[PDB]
Design an enzyme around this catalytic site. Structure first.
Site, PDB file in Angstrom:
ATOM      1  N   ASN A 114      -2.635   2.332  13.822  1.00 18.27           N
ATOM      2  CA  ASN A 114      -2.815   3.668  13.262  1.00 18.27           C
ATOM      3  C   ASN A 114      -3.962   3.583  12.270  1.00 18.27           C
ATOM      4  O   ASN A 114      -3.792   3.094  11.155  1.00 18.27           O
ATOM      5  CB  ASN A 114      -1.538   4.122  12.569  1.00 18.27           C
ATOM      6  CG  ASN A 114      -1.513   5.601  12.286  1.00 18.27           C
ATOM      7  OD1 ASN A 114      -2.528   6.232  11.954  1.00 18.27           O
ATOM      8  ND2 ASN A 114      -0.334   6.175  12.430  1.00 18.27           N
TER       9      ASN A 114
ATOM     10  N   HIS B  39       1.527   3.825   2.090  1.00 17.85           N
ATOM     11  CA  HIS B  39       2.217   4.471   3.197  1.00 17.85           C
ATOM     12  C   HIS B  39       3.725   4.382   3.036  1.00 17.85           C
ATOM     13  O   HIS B  39       4.264   3.416   2.487  1.00 17.85           O
ATOM     14  CB  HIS B  39       1.800   3.862   4.553  1.00 17.85           C
ATOM     15  CG  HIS B  39       0.452   4.291   4.994  1.00 17.85           C
ATOM     16  ND1 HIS B  39      -0.285   3.590   5.925  1.00 17.85           N
ATOM     17  CD2 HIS B  39      -0.297   5.365   4.651  1.00 17.85           C
ATOM     18  CE1 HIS B  39      -1.432   4.212   6.132  1.00 17.85           C
ATOM     19  NE2 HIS B  39      -1.471   5.290   5.368  1.00 17.85           N
TER      20      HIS B  39
ATOM     21  N   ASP C 154       6.106   3.594   4.882  1.00 15.82           N
ATOM     22  CA  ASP C 154       6.809   2.394   5.332  1.00 15.82           C
ATOM     23  C   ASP C 154       6.857   1.303   4.263  1.00 15.82           C
ATOM     24  O   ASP C 154       7.688   0.389   4.361  1.00 15.82           O
ATOM     25  CB  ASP C 154       6.166   1.842   6.608  1.00 15.82           C
ATOM     26  CG  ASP C 154       4.690   1.511   6.440  1.00 15.82           C
ATOM     27  OD1 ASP C 154       4.000   2.216   5.670  1.00 15.82           O
ATOM     28  OD2 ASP C 154       4.222   0.525   7.063  1.00 15.82           O
TER      29      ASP C 154
ATOM     30  N   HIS D   9      -6.541  -1.764   6.683  1.00 14.11           N
ATOM     31  CA  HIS D   9      -5.624  -0.772   7.246  1.00 14.11           C
ATOM     32  C   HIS D   9      -5.592   0.474   6.371  1.00 14.11           C
ATOM     33  O   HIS D   9      -5.500   1.605   6.864  1.00 14.11           O
ATOM     34  CB  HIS D   9      -4.232  -1.400   7.350  1.00 14.11           C
ATOM     35  CG  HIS D   9      -3.114  -0.438   7.595  1.00 14.11           C
ATOM     36  ND1 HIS D   9      -2.745  -0.019   8.854  1.00 14.11           N
ATOM     37  CD2 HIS D   9      -2.234   0.134   6.738  1.00 14.11           C
ATOM     38  CE1 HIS D   9      -1.706   0.797   8.760  1.00 14.11           C
ATOM     39  NE2 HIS D   9      -1.382   0.913   7.483  1.00 14.11           N
TER      40      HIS D   9
ATOM     41  N   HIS E  13       0.854  -1.197   0.000  1.00 17.09           N
ATOM     42  CA  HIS E  13       0.000   0.000   0.000  1.00 17.09           C
ATOM     43  C   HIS E  13       0.883   1.238   0.000  1.00 17.09           C
ATOM     44  O   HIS E  13       2.107   1.139  -0.025  1.00 17.09           O
ATOM     45  CB  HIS E  13      -1.014   0.037   1.172  1.00 17.09           C
ATOM     46  CG  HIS E  13      -0.411   0.114   2.548  1.00 17.09           C
ATOM     47  ND1 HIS E  13       0.083  -0.992   3.204  1.00 17.09           N
ATOM     48  CD2 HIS E  13      -0.297   1.145   3.428  1.00 17.09           C
ATOM     49  CE1 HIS E  13       0.518  -0.637   4.403  1.00 17.09           C
ATOM     50  NE2 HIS E  13       0.288   0.650   4.566  1.00 17.09           N
TER      51      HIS E  13
HETATM   52  O1  LIG Z   1       3.477   0.963  11.607  1.00 18.23           O
HETATM   53  C1  LIG Z   1       2.443   1.467  11.344  1.00 18.23           C
HETATM   54  N1  LIG Z   1       1.234   1.119  12.031  1.00 18.23           N
HETATM   55  C2  LIG Z   1       1.304   0.066  12.980  1.00 18.23           C
HETATM   56  C3  LIG Z   1       1.652   0.702  14.335  1.00 18.23           C
HETATM   57  C4  LIG Z   1       1.791  -0.338  15.446  1.00 18.23           C
HETATM   58  C5  LIG Z   1       0.911  -0.601  16.480  1.00 18.23           C
HETATM   59  N2  LIG Z   1       1.396  -1.597  17.220  1.00 18.23           N
HETATM   60  C6  LIG Z   1       2.573  -1.991  16.722  1.00 18.23           C
HETATM   61  C7  LIG Z   1       3.460  -2.987  17.140  1.00 18.23           C
HETATM   62  C8  LIG Z   1       4.625  -3.206  16.433  1.00 18.23           C
HETATM   63  C9  LIG Z   1       4.927  -2.451  15.293  1.00 18.23           C
HETATM   64  C10 LIG Z   1       4.038  -1.462  14.870  1.00 18.23           C
HETATM   65  C11 LIG Z   1       2.858  -1.235  15.601  1.00 18.23           C
HETATM   66  C12 LIG Z   1      -0.090  -0.480  12.936  1.00 18.23           C
HETATM   67  O2  LIG Z   1      -0.983   0.283  12.479  1.00 18.23           O
HETATM   68  O3  LIG Z   1      -0.343  -1.649  13.321  1.00 18.23           O
HETATM   69  C13 LIG Z   1       2.286   2.627  10.385  1.00 18.23           C
HETATM   70  N3  LIG Z   1       1.081   3.098  10.257  1.00 18.23           N
HETATM   71  C14 LIG Z   1       0.859   4.123   9.480  1.00 18.23           C
HETATM   72 CL1  LIG Z   1      -0.780   4.742   9.314  1.00 18.23          CL
HETATM   73  C15 LIG Z   1       1.866   4.765   8.781  1.00 18.23           C
HETATM   74  C16 LIG Z   1       1.522   5.865   7.968  1.00 18.23           C
HETATM   75  C17 LIG Z   1       2.505   6.511   7.243  1.00 18.23           C
HETATM   76  C18 LIG Z   1       3.813   6.082   7.347  1.00 18.23           C
HETATM   77  C19 LIG Z   1       4.134   4.975   8.155  1.00 18.23           C
HETATM   78  C20 LIG Z   1       3.138   4.317   8.887  1.00 18.23           C
HETATM   79  C21 LIG Z   1       3.351   3.190   9.728  1.00 18.23           C
HETATM   80  O4  LIG Z   1       4.602   2.614   9.945  1.00 18.23           O
HETATM   81 ZN   LIG Z   2       0.174   1.704   6.402  1.00 15.99          ZN
END
Ligand SMILES: O=C(N[C@@H](Cc1c[nH]c2ccccc12)C(=O)O)c1nc(Cl)c2ccccc2c1O
Ligand SMILES: [Zn+2]
Length: 230
Positions: free
Chosen positions: A179, A85, A87, A148, A83
């Site tokens: 997130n 994002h 990452d 997501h 997707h």
């Molecule tokens: O890592 C992400 N989200 C994880 C966070 C998480 C919860 N608990 C965790 C435990 C371990 C690692 C990551 C997690 C999740 O949503 O599950 C993430 N989310 C969003 Cl929107 C991003 C948007 C833009 C750029 C990078 C992003 C990103 O890395």
């Molecule tokens: Zn994402």
């Protein structure tokens, strides 16, 4: 033995064999005040490699390529971002310079560009509707619907019954949907159901973050995401 955030430094990448010809790549990054691990997929196709997702940024992704050339020694010829994002598309520029042909769905490319993120070169057709599937190399790419993100894709390796969910799928340790700013909480359980129905013989399931498991990951994700909504 699966690497954890404590065991990987930011900038380092580890590879982890899941099956004959199938690896995950684990990286760490600083984000939203935290240090998080992240998973991706590597799949051998002859004497070539298909990369699924970057290692979260230029720096990590270059290390990923350098870890691969050391530990595997086959060229990465293509990469798919699951997707838009950062990452998952961050490092796409590094892959391109290395000669890798980068791919994503048209919606992912649109959303990435509007976000100011790096844009994979090639478009993946035939994934525009919930439940669409296409073959791409030796894997199958499946759009289960919004979860997501509206665009997130999951990737099945039939030769090894390995299912990579990206951030649409949650590790067992997870108790929150993460997130969700970009998520469709209303559609995510239905999307997880489409995954479950389409891959009943999946033996190993790899979430976007954390530890692998089995088909229990899908129902866990469904449980978490439903409880969040209610
Ligand atoms: O890592 C992400 N989200 C994880 C966070 C998480 C919860 N608990 C965790 C435990 C371990 C690692 C990551 C997690 C999740 O949503 O599950 C993430 N989310 C969003 Cl929107 C991003 C948007 C833009 C750029 C990078 C992003 C990103 O890395
Ligand atoms: Zn994402």
């Amino acid at each position: 033995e699966y690497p954890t955030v404590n065991e990987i430094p930011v900038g380092e990448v580890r590879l982890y064999q899941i099956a004959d010809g199938v690896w995950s790549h684990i990286a760490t990054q600083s984000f939203d005040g935290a240090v998080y691990p992240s998973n991706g997929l590597i799949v051998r196709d002859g004497d070539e490699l298909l990369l699924i997702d970057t290692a979260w940024g230029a720096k990590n992704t270059a290390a990923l390529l350098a870890e691969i050339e050391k530990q595997i020694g086959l060229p990465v010829t293509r990469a798919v971002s699951t997707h838009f994002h950062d990452d998952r598309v961050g490092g796409v520029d590094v892959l391109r310079k290395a000669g890798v042909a980068t791919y994503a769905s048209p919606s992912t490319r649109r959303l990435a560009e509007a976000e100011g993120n790096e844009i994979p070169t090639h478009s993946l057709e035939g994934l525009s509707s919930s439940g669409d599937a296409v073959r791409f190399g030796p894997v199958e790419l499946f759009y289960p619907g919004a979860a997501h993100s509206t665009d997130n894709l999951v990737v099945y390796v039939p030769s090894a019954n390995v299912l990579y969910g990206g951030x649409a799928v949650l590790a067992l340790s997870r108790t929150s949907a993460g997130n969700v700013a970009d998520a469709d909480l209303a559609e995510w359980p239905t999307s997880v159901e489409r995954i479950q129905k389409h891959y009943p013989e999946a033996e190993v399931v790899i979430p976007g973050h954390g530890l692998p498991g089995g088909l229990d990951l899908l129902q866990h994700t469904a449980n978490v995401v439903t409880a969040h909504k209610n």
